[PDB]
Amino acid sequence: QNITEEFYQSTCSAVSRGYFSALRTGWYTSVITIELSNIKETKCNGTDTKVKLIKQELDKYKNAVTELQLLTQNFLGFLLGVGSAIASGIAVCKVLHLEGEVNKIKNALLSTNKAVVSLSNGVSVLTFKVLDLKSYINNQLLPILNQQSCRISNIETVIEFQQKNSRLLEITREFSVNAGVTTPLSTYMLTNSELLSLINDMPITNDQKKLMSSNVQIVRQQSYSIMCIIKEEVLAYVVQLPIYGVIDTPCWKLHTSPLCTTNIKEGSNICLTRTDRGWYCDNAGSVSFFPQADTCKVQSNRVFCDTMNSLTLPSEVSLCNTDIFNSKYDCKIMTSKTDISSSVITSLGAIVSCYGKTKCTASNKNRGIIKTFSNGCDYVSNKGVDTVSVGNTLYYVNKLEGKNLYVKGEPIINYYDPLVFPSDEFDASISQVNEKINQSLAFI
Amino acid sequence: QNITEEFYQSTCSAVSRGYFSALRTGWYTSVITIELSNIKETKCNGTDTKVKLIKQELDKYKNAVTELQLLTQNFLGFLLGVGSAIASGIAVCKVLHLEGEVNKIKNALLSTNKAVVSLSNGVSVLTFKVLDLKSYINNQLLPILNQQSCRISNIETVIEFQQKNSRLLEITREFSVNAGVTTPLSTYMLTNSELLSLINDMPITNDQKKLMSSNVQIVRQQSYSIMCIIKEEVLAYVVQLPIYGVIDTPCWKLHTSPLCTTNIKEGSNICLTRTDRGWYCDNAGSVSFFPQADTCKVQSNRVFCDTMNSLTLPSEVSLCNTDIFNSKYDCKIMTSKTDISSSVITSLGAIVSCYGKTKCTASNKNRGIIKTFSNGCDYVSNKGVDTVSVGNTLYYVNKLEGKNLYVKGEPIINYYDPLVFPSDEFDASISQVNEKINQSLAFI
Amino acid sequence: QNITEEFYQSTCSAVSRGYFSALRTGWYTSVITIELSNIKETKCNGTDTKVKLIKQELDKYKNAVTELQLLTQNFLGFLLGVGSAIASGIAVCKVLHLEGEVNKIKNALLSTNKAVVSLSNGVSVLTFKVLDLKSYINNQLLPILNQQSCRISNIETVIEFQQKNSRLLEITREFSVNAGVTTPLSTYMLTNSELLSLINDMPITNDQKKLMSSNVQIVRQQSYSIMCIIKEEVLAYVVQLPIYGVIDTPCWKLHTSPLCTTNIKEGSNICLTRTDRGWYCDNAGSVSFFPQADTCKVQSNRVFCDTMNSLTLPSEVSLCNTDIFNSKYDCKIMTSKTDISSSVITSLGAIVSCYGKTKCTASNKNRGIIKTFSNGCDYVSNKGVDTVSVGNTLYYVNKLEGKNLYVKGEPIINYYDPLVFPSDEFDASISQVNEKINQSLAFI
């Protein structure tokens, strides 16, 4: 929607504003249960295609129960020792293993299929019964299987049993190939009917309920399913859903690109790049910063992010966009001598860093070339433009309409004397390049 | 096939030549459609296993339509702001949302199952009808379901309806777990029969058609499926297939490994590594360079790559393989003091960098050890050799026959005086280490 | 189980001990085979729902055979040219293509479903026959399909044929979407019954057999399935299972975090971080080091790792934990001026690096805040603590009981004069910062 973008010619960066936050800060857990029956041996002469057919669909059942039994018996550096995403789920699994805890769940779901249960560790969980394979196998099936002559009446029972068993096998293969933990949340793990029902009874605001149920596909991508326990005629697993404790605060995206002096010969040029690119959202008097790509998902002008993937910075960090030389926040940059041509596709446009003999242009599919980029760091709005070419590579601009603004100014690389420029700083900042230069100039 | 490899003792690198390019430069889009019926409520007393069985298979149908409805309502740093792979597909989705555009498609496919359609934005698309669930549900099914007493005749209709519905549910779960965009291209999204049919009618050369239909498995790995629209008794989604606009130009792979001085004691040695490893293909008077691992897939002597993942370099870049000190291209290297033993498996052999007390050897499973590597950077051909051991780690050489060549020369690390060697350059080059040394030598 | 952890206040690191190794060093291969029939055209008038229903399930069969036919016709930098994980499998595929080699397998499995076969390249393989689609289609099905009038008797045969065909289609779609190589090992590729049977007949110790069959889910995550050959009425593919040649040696995990001087103003502080974090296991007189995250999977106090992902270091490397200034191993560190607050979740606790105005605390869900962290690098045990907060981010401590130990000492960053501190070392070491300082101090 109302999205705007500013490009800063001086620092070769661009900021996309107009977005609104939805940052995960809490976790909600609920317990999904399937009712099982513990059928062992069925003394039955078979060979009759119909009996042999239902015995092998019964074999799939015992194989999945067994497979589940085998599961239950057992700036980016700053984000590596982050811990387990599923701790609050695992906390619920520990409790279901306590004696009689599964028994509490069964009795709560004996009369209905959805009930609130107070667990023994203080968390109040919503519990669902999504499949009753127990009373199907015990009632509408097992009597036929417990006389020495076993003759199923009609093939309809073979098909009815495959349909009942089917969801259990879909749930088991997902846990199998994923060591008991799956994300995103399958429709098989939680159907849309059950997920909206769950969201509606969450201890959250009507604001958060309406945000979640308008983007169920995003809630799935940020939820986990955890295989839990399989005892006492019950299968249970924990669904872990996000809670967006930060809502509707301003978010902005920083795009950066290498800024270099413009001599055509390679290596005789000094470069400089802002390293603080990523997503920024205001969050409790500070700024939550998301440096990693694909840790935030955009929908129109709403940003969903998980604060587990963020760093906290002082809110002054945004001063680097408007005044990189400011004395309130030391803005972070890297330096090099690698003048390779490249383009960054922003929200409402494109940044192009053209160096050497490279051919960099911006085109319209019907009109031809609309801008030929000179050497240096320039910018184009996505209005009237479909593609950007850089060397032999074709980039596609985004086609969303917004307000673009070009803030002219001198490239700050021009302020630096190349004879005393620290030209291989992996992770520095503005005043760290200044104090490194102040040493060299005093050596003279 | 005719593959050759050169190892350069002087720069501890190896080049595998003999390959031929297939670089994606264009995108082809076609519209796949499934015909739907908009059945809401069926007033039917059931309970009879057969009727209740077909009502729940009908429930799966409405659940998938709903799930699709929920989707439609809504050197490596130089490759991060690259944009959307699926822009030209999304451009086609925007058009199908225009009024009457889906109506154009329906009428084109009313008489046949494959037809060319001219869309309203100028792109001529090939359109497929792969499933007609409309006329099945409306004709061979719904009459039975619209009298107050509903009795399906035979179980065959329950099974026939599951088979018809089945592909729709397979397509919907893939879009569900992937937020409406999937890659590689499922056989469920596009069968081999439909994909070869599509390739045969593409606006491309008989050369490109024969290349694509000889490697359908690779075309799948480089294609996208995009969920699009679900209105007016039609489901439609866009398949986006690659176009290889660069074909049969020479490609070569650069393998690099750390080159260091050979004192056994750790840290008292200086190291130096070429950083320009990856794939290189000639491309329109320049060289397309693929620095990222797994962005190129090899089949015999053919390299498939996506130019979206490349950088453009001057063709002079290959001079670094034969003369790293050349004055036409500043060859890029890094420096360190980290002499850790390691091996690189090349196309037709292995590079071994052996330092310290490490045991590095090359073996034959029947003959024993064939080469024991001294300290420094050495190389072995894959003829008569199965494995390379480095410390406690076993590497397996590739078993393809080719021409190996060993270019003797002095390790360039020996040319550098260690007392004035910039020994922690993250991203430098030959003449940047030279000018950094020229400063230190004048300080004296 | 008996897990202990030490935190070193001086170097801002923590070591989790008590673990025991299971490192993959060998590969076992076996050949799984499905018996096929090469049915081409069946001259049959149909239209009868039952015949048309079995003809399309027969179509799925030929489509999967075709799809398989299309497949058969065709510190972290030190780990990039590692080679192919599946070399020893591919070596077995080459042999099955030799003339009469598939014929050897068929005759070995003509009388039973599991047999040892001696291949022509010297490897003795265990061979399984998991599905006999040949004699089903040829005997219990094809006679009905080879008179001009084709009338299937009962719908039971349609369902029986779907069940037989079903596993073949599950195997084919996995190979399809994965270019003939899949990991982890599907239950569809190898059932739990077949996998335990295979492990029991492996040429390995009763120790290794009991370790593997107690963790089948881990064996799956470290195994590969390779599509191989489809000729002469046989489908065959190779399963490649790990062999743990290193068992029960001590493993320990190193956790590191940035250590910095504690002035609140940003950038005027020098930092220093140990870069050697990861897993370490004793291995044949040396130490196997696993720098990459998620290349080791933990179960209670057992560590499963693949030595293909490791480096070999001298066993002296562990001296850095107890004496970072030691003269036997040059301990590796990086330096910067980036004092951003962050926390590392260790095995039995949490490391917190608190800098600037950031609010860093450790909480109990019932008691409130239990520790407020001062500026600098501190540590908390997981006893009585559930969460750690750093700025706006909530981290969850692990809830396993163990022995924690806090080794007090002075932060080594305090030993360095900031006026001559090389404050942007990407990959250095203790004595490399010393010799870099010795130059600056002599310049004076």
Side-chain angles (χ1 to χ4, degrees), chain A residues 180-193:
Chain A
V181 174
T182 65
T183 173
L185 193 62
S186 305
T187 52
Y188 291 124
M189 296 275 177
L190 205 65
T191 70
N192 285 314
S193 165

mmCIF file of all heavy atoms in Angstrom, chain A residues 180-193:
data_model
loop_
_atom_site.group_PDB
_atom_site.id
_atom_site.type_symbol
_atom_site.label_atom_id
_atom_site.label_comp_id
_atom_site.label_asym_id
_atom_site.label_seq_id
_atom_site.Cartn_x
_atom_site.Cartn_y
_atom_site.Cartn_z
ATOM 1 N N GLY A 180 10.587 -36.148 14.071
ATOM 2 C CA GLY A 180 9.552 -35.798 15.024
ATOM 3 C C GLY A 180 9.236 -34.325 15.161
ATOM 4 O O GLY A 180 8.457 -33.967 16.050
ATOM 5 N N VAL A 181 9.816 -33.456 14.329
ATOM 6 C CA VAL A 181 9.561 -32.015 14.380
ATOM 7 C C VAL A 181 9.407 -31.497 12.958
ATOM 8 O O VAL A 181 10.283 -31.726 12.119
ATOM 9 C CB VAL A 181 10.687 -31.256 15.110
ATOM 10 C CG1 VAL A 181 10.459 -29.752 15.020
ATOM 11 C CG2 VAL A 181 10.769 -31.691 16.558
ATOM 12 N N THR A 182 8.306 -30.795 12.678
ATOM 13 C CA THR A 182 8.003 -30.362 11.316
ATOM 14 C C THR A 182 7.600 -28.889 11.266
ATOM 15 O O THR A 182 6.882 -28.399 12.145
ATOM 16 C CB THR A 182 6.869 -31.195 10.697
ATOM 17 O OG1 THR A 182 5.661 -30.953 11.423
ATOM 18 C CG2 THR A 182 7.184 -32.678 10.732
ATOM 19 N N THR A 183 8.052 -28.191 10.211
ATOM 20 C CA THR A 183 7.665 -26.814 9.912
ATOM 21 C C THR A 183 7.859 -26.569 8.422
ATOM 22 O O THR A 183 8.907 -26.915 7.873
ATOM 23 C CB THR A 183 8.471 -25.789 10.729
ATOM 24 O OG1 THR A 183 8.163 -24.454 10.285
ATOM 25 C CG2 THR A 183 9.983 -26.024 10.600
ATOM 26 N N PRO A 184 6.901 -25.948 7.735
ATOM 27 C CA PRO A 184 5.650 -25.398 8.261
ATOM 28 C C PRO A 184 4.642 -26.437 8.726
ATOM 29 O O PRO A 184 4.847 -27.645 8.581
ATOM 30 C CB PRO A 184 5.087 -24.605 7.073
ATOM 31 C CG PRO A 184 5.810 -25.108 5.878
ATOM 32 C CD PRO A 184 7.159 -25.501 6.359
ATOM 33 N N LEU A 185 3.553 -25.939 9.304
ATOM 34 C CA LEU A 185 2.499 -26.776 9.859
ATOM 35 C C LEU A 185 1.643 -27.323 8.725
ATOM 36 O O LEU A 185 0.968 -26.561 8.024
ATOM 37 C CB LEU A 185 1.667 -25.959 10.836
ATOM 38 C CG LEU A 185 0.732 -26.744 11.734
ATOM 39 C CD1 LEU A 185 1.533 -27.684 12.611
ATOM 40 C CD2 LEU A 185 -0.061 -25.767 12.573
ATOM 41 N N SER A 186 1.671 -28.644 8.541
ATOM 42 C CA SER A 186 0.877 -29.286 7.501
ATOM 43 C C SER A 186 -0.598 -29.009 7.701
ATOM 44 O O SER A 186 -1.080 -28.861 8.823
ATOM 45 C CB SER A 186 1.078 -30.795 7.517
ATOM 46 O OG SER A 186 2.447 -31.099 7.422
ATOM 47 N N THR A 187 -1.326 -28.957 6.589
ATOM 48 C CA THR A 187 -2.768 -29.122 6.692
ATOM 49 C C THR A 187 -3.106 -30.478 7.295
ATOM 50 O O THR A 187 -4.096 -30.600 8.022
ATOM 51 C CB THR A 187 -3.415 -28.957 5.322
ATOM 52 O OG1 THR A 187 -2.761 -29.827 4.389
ATOM 53 C CG2 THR A 187 -3.288 -27.516 4.856
ATOM 54 N N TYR A 188 -2.277 -31.496 7.034
ATOM 55 C CA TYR A 188 -2.481 -32.805 7.653
ATOM 56 C C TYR A 188 -2.272 -32.750 9.166
ATOM 57 O O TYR A 188 -2.996 -33.415 9.918
ATOM 58 C CB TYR A 188 -1.549 -33.845 7.026
ATOM 59 C CG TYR A 188 -1.862 -34.214 5.587
ATOM 60 C CD1 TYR A 188 -0.893 -34.082 4.596
ATOM 61 C CD2 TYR A 188 -3.117 -34.697 5.216
ATOM 62 C CE1 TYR A 188 -1.160 -34.418 3.275
ATOM 63 C CE2 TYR A 188 -3.392 -35.038 3.892
ATOM 64 C CZ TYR A 188 -2.407 -34.896 2.930
ATOM 65 O OH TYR A 188 -2.653 -35.223 1.613
ATOM 66 N N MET A 189 -1.284 -31.975 9.635
ATOM 67 C CA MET A 189 -1.092 -31.836 11.078
ATOM 68 C C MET A 189 -2.232 -31.055 11.707
ATOM 69 O O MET A 189 -2.714 -31.409 12.787
ATOM 70 C CB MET A 189 0.231 -31.142 11.387
ATOM 71 C CG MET A 189 1.466 -31.899 10.967
ATOM 72 S SD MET A 189 1.979 -33.097 12.199
ATOM 73 C CE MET A 189 3.368 -33.841 11.347
ATOM 74 N N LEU A 190 -2.665 -29.985 11.049
ATOM 75 C CA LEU A 190 -3.739 -29.135 11.554
ATOM 76 C C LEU A 190 -4.494 -28.602 10.343
ATOM 77 O O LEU A 190 -3.933 -27.838 9.552
ATOM 78 C CB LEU A 190 -3.173 -28.003 12.408
ATOM 79 C CG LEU A 190 -4.108 -27.399 13.454
ATOM 80 C CD1 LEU A 190 -4.428 -28.452 14.511
ATOM 81 C CD2 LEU A 190 -3.503 -26.149 14.094
ATOM 82 N N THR A 191 -5.746 -29.018 10.178
ATOM 83 C CA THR A 191 -6.531 -28.550 9.044
ATOM 84 C C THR A 191 -6.900 -27.080 9.232
ATOM 85 O O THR A 191 -6.797 -26.527 10.332
ATOM 86 C CB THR A 191 -7.787 -29.400 8.875
ATOM 87 O OG1 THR A 191 -8.692 -29.135 9.950
ATOM 88 C CG2 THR A 191 -7.425 -30.868 8.900
ATOM 89 N N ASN A 192 -7.312 -26.436 8.131
ATOM 90 C CA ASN A 192 -7.713 -25.031 8.209
ATOM 91 C C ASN A 192 -8.888 -24.850 9.152
ATOM 92 O O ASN A 192 -8.980 -23.838 9.856
ATOM 93 C CB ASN A 192 -8.074 -24.490 6.832
ATOM 94 C CG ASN A 192 -6.866 -24.241 5.978
ATOM 95 O OD1 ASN A 192 -5.870 -23.661 6.430
ATOM 96 N ND2 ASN A 192 -6.934 -24.695 4.728
ATOM 97 N N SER A 193 -9.802 -25.822 9.169
ATOM 98 C CA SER A 193 -10.929 -25.778 10.091
ATOM 99 C C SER A 193 -10.448 -25.794 11.539
ATOM 100 O O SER A 193 -10.913 -25.003 12.368
ATOM 101 C CB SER A 193 -11.865 -26.950 9.804
ATOM 102 O OG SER A 193 -12.782 -27.151 10.863
#
